[PDB]
Short mmCIF file of all heavy atoms in Angstrom, two decimals:
data_model
loop_
_atom_site.label_atom_id
_atom_site.label_comp_id
_atom_site.label_asym_id
_atom_site.label_seq_id
_atom_site.Cartn_x
_atom_site.Cartn_y
_atom_site.Cartn_z
N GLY I 102 -20.45 11.00 14.36
CA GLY I 102 -20.25 10.64 15.76
C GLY I 102 -18.80 10.38 16.12
O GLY I 102 -18.33 10.97 17.08
N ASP I 103 -18.09 9.53 15.36
CA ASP I 103 -16.72 9.06 15.72
C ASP I 103 -15.80 10.13 16.30
O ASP I 103 -15.98 11.31 15.98
CB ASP I 103 -16.04 8.42 14.50
CG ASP I 103 -16.49 7.01 14.27
OD1 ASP I 103 -17.72 6.78 14.20
OD2 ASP I 103 -15.62 6.12 14.20
N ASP I 104 -14.85 9.74 17.14
CA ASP I 104 -14.00 10.71 17.88
C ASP I 104 -13.32 11.78 16.98
O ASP I 104 -13.34 12.97 17.30
CB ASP I 104 -12.97 9.99 18.77
CG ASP I 104 -13.61 9.34 20.03
OD1 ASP I 104 -14.86 9.36 20.19
OD2 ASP I 104 -12.84 8.80 20.85
N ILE I 105 -12.71 11.33 15.86
CA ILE I 105 -12.03 12.22 14.91
C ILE I 105 -13.02 13.25 14.37
O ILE I 105 -12.72 14.41 14.21
CB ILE I 105 -11.35 11.41 13.76
CG1 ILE I 105 -10.48 12.29 12.87
CG2 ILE I 105 -12.37 10.67 12.90
CD1 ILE I 105 -9.19 12.70 13.48
N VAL I 106 -14.24 12.82 14.15
CA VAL I 106 -15.25 13.71 13.66
C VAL I 106 -15.59 14.79 14.68
O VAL I 106 -15.72 15.96 14.33
CB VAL I 106 -16.50 12.90 13.19
CG1 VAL I 106 -17.62 13.86 12.89
CG2 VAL I 106 -16.15 12.11 11.92
N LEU I 107 -15.68 14.42 15.95
CA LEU I 107 -15.93 15.40 16.99
C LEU I 107 -14.74 16.36 17.11
O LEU I 107 -14.93 17.56 17.36
CB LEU I 107 -16.23 14.71 18.34
CG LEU I 107 -17.63 14.06 18.41
CD1 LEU I 107 -17.70 13.07 19.57
CD2 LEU I 107 -18.73 15.11 18.52
N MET I 108 -13.54 15.85 16.90
CA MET I 108 -12.36 16.71 16.94
C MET I 108 -12.42 17.74 15.79
O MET I 108 -12.22 18.96 16.00
CB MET I 108 -11.10 15.85 16.89
CG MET I 108 -10.90 15.00 18.15
SD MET I 108 -9.59 13.81 17.88
CE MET I 108 -8.15 14.83 18.16
N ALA I 109 -12.72 17.26 14.57
CA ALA I 109 -12.83 18.12 13.40
C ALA I 109 -13.92 19.20 13.55
O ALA I 109 -13.69 20.37 13.23
CB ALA I 109 -13.09 17.31 12.13
N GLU I 110 -15.09 18.79 14.01
CA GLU I 110 -16.18 19.73 14.31
C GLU I 110 -15.77 20.85 15.26
O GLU I 110 -16.14 22.02 15.06
CB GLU I 110 -17.36 18.95 14.87
CG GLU I 110 -18.00 18.07 13.81
CD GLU I 110 -19.20 17.28 14.34
OE1 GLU I 110 -19.27 16.95 15.55
OE2 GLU I 110 -20.07 17.00 13.50
N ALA I 111 -15.01 20.51 16.30
CA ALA I 111 -14.55 21.49 17.29
C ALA I 111 -13.53 22.41 16.64
O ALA I 111 -13.55 23.64 16.83
CB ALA I 111 -13.96 20.80 18.51
N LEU I 112 -12.64 21.83 15.86
CA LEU I 112 -11.69 22.64 15.15
C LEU I 112 -12.41 23.56 14.16
O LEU I 112 -12.03 24.73 14.02
CB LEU I 112 -10.63 21.76 14.42
CG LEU I 112 -9.43 21.28 15.21
CD1 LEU I 112 -8.52 20.38 14.35
CD2 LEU I 112 -8.66 22.49 15.72
N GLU I 113 -13.39 23.03 13.44
CA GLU I 113 -14.11 23.80 12.42
C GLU I 113 -14.89 24.95 13.03
O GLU I 113 -15.00 26.02 12.44
CB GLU I 113 -15.09 22.92 11.65
CG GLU I 113 -15.82 23.70 10.55
CD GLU I 113 -16.66 22.83 9.63
OE1 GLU I 113 -17.02 21.72 10.01
OE2 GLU I 113 -16.96 23.29 8.51
N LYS I 114 -15.48 24.69 14.20
CA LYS I 114 -16.26 25.73 14.92
C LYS I 114 -15.37 26.94 15.17
O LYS I 114 -15.70 28.08 14.81
CB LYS I 114 -16.80 25.19 16.24
CG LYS I 114 -17.74 26.18 16.95
CD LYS I 114 -18.34 25.59 18.21
CE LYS I 114 -19.03 26.69 19.05
NZ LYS I 114 -19.97 26.09 20.05
N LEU I 115 -14.18 26.66 15.70
CA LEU I 115 -13.15 27.67 16.00
C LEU I 115 -12.63 28.38 14.74
O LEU I 115 -12.55 29.62 14.70
CB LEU I 115 -12.00 27.01 16.79
CG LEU I 115 -10.86 27.89 17.31
CD1 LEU I 115 -11.42 29.02 18.16
CD2 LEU I 115 -9.88 27.03 18.12
N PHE I 116 -12.30 27.60 13.71
CA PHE I 116 -12.04 28.14 12.35
C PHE I 116 -13.02 29.17 11.91
O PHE I 116 -12.64 30.32 11.57
CB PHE I 116 -12.03 26.98 11.34
CG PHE I 116 -11.79 27.43 9.94
CD1 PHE I 116 -10.58 28.05 9.61
CD2 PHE I 116 -12.77 27.27 8.97
CE1 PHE I 116 -10.36 28.48 8.28
CE2 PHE I 116 -12.56 27.69 7.66
CZ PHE I 116 -11.34 28.29 7.33
N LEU I 117 -14.29 28.78 11.89
CA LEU I 117 -15.37 29.69 11.48
C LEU I 117 -15.42 30.96 12.33
O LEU I 117 -15.62 32.06 11.78
CB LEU I 117 -16.72 28.97 11.51
CG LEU I 117 -16.85 27.87 10.46
CD1 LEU I 117 -18.15 27.07 10.66
CD2 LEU I 117 -16.74 28.50 9.07
N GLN I 118 -15.22 30.82 13.65
CA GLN I 118 -15.21 31.97 14.56
C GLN I 118 -14.10 32.94 14.17
O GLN I 118 -14.26 34.16 14.21
CB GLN I 118 -14.95 31.54 16.02
CG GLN I 118 -16.09 30.81 16.72
CD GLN I 118 -15.63 30.19 18.05
OE1 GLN I 118 -16.09 29.12 18.43
NE2 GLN I 118 -14.71 30.86 18.74
N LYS I 119 -12.93 32.39 13.82
CA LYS I 119 -11.81 33.21 13.51
C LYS I 119 -12.03 33.87 12.13
O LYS I 119 -11.84 35.09 12.00
CB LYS I 119 -10.49 32.42 13.60
CG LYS I 119 -10.12 31.97 15.01
CD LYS I 119 -9.94 33.18 15.94
CE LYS I 119 -9.33 32.83 17.27
NZ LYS I 119 -8.92 34.09 17.96
N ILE I 120 -12.45 33.11 11.12
CA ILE I 120 -12.64 33.74 9.78
C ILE I 120 -13.87 34.66 9.76
O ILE I 120 -13.99 35.44 8.85
CB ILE I 120 -12.65 32.77 8.57
CG1 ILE I 120 -13.88 31.87 8.58
CG2 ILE I 120 -11.33 31.97 8.45
CD1 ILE I 120 -14.01 31.04 7.31
N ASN I 121 -14.76 34.59 10.75
CA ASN I 121 -15.82 35.61 10.88
C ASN I 121 -15.24 37.03 11.05
O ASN I 121 -15.93 38.03 10.81
CB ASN I 121 -16.72 35.33 12.09
CG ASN I 121 -17.92 36.25 12.11
OD1 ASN I 121 -18.55 36.48 11.08
ND2 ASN I 121 -18.21 36.83 13.26
N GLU I 122 -13.98 37.12 11.49
CA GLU I 122 -13.36 38.41 11.71
C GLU I 122 -12.21 38.70 10.76
O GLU I 122 -11.38 39.56 11.04
CB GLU I 122 -12.91 38.49 13.18
CG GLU I 122 -14.07 38.41 14.13
CD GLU I 122 -13.78 39.10 15.45
OE1 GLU I 122 -12.94 38.57 16.20
OE2 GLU I 122 -14.38 40.16 15.72
N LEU I 123 -12.18 38.00 9.63
CA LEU I 123 -11.20 38.26 8.58
C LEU I 123 -11.23 39.74 8.25
O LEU I 123 -12.31 40.30 8.06
CB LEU I 123 -11.53 37.44 7.32
CG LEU I 123 -10.50 37.40 6.17
CD1 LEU I 123 -9.26 36.65 6.57
CD2 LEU I 123 -11.10 36.77 4.92
#
Side-chain angles (χ1 to χ4, degrees):
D103 279 53
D104 287 5
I105 188 74
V106 171
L107 287 163
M108 293 169 81
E110 291 180 331
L112 276 178
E113 182 172 20
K114 186 176 168 163
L115 184 56
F116 180 62
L117 294 172
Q118 288 169 215
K119 293 299 191 167
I120 68 173
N121 189 44
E122 297 206 290
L123 189 69

